[PDB]
Amino acid sequence: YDIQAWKKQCEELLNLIFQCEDSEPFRQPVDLLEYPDYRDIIDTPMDFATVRETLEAGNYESPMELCKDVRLIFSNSKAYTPSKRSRIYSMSLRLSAFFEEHISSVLSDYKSALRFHKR
Numbered sequence: 001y002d003i004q005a006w007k008k009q010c011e012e013l014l015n016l017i018f019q020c021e022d023s024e025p026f027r028q029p030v031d032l033l034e035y036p037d038y039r040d041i042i043d044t045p046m047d048f049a050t051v052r053e054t055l056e057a058g059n060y061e062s063p064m065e066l067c068k069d070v071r072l073i074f075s076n077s078k079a080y081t082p083s084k085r086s087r088i089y090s091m092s093l094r095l096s097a098f099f100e101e102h103i104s105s106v107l108s109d110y111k112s113a114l115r116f117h118k119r
């Protein structure tokens with residue numbers, strides 16, 4: 001029932017994401033020089049370095065907030081892709097499946113810890 005445990009769990013999950021090849025297009029903000037129309041389609045850019053930095057600065061209050069930002073990386077990829085068969089979008093789907101598979105217990109444990117605290 002550790003209310004703070006999600007933070008290190010998210011740091012470890014981000015380490016796994018950064019280790020894998022599929023995260024390369026999502027590690028840093030999208031290069032606007034290589035994709036000049038990006039901000040015409042995407043309102044809120046997001047990347048894994050920004051998520052990790054927000055976490056490390058103590059600027060997430062819960063794993064749900066981190067999860068909303070990570071999901072924004074994947075929804076931005078889906079919205080910017082010219083095709084559902086594109087290389088970068090296909091990497092985003094694999095990374096999203098891995099992220100969802102691992103964030104589920106982090107969210108459940110956190111919500112369980114808060115319920116126990118409220119008793």
Ligand SMILES: COc1cc(Br)ccc1CC(=O)O
Pocket residue numbers: 025026029030031035076077078080081082086088089
């Ligand atoms: C992650 O942003 C993208 C998502 C998709 Br889908 C296609 C291209 C980009 C730009 C980039 O390759 O950084």
Ligand SMILES: COc1cc(Br)ccc1CC(=O)O
Pocket residue numbers: 016017019020021022091094095098
């Ligand atoms: C850290 O990422 C992974 C680790 C393992 Br094991 C399997 C799949 C992935 C996701 C991906 O490579 O897209």
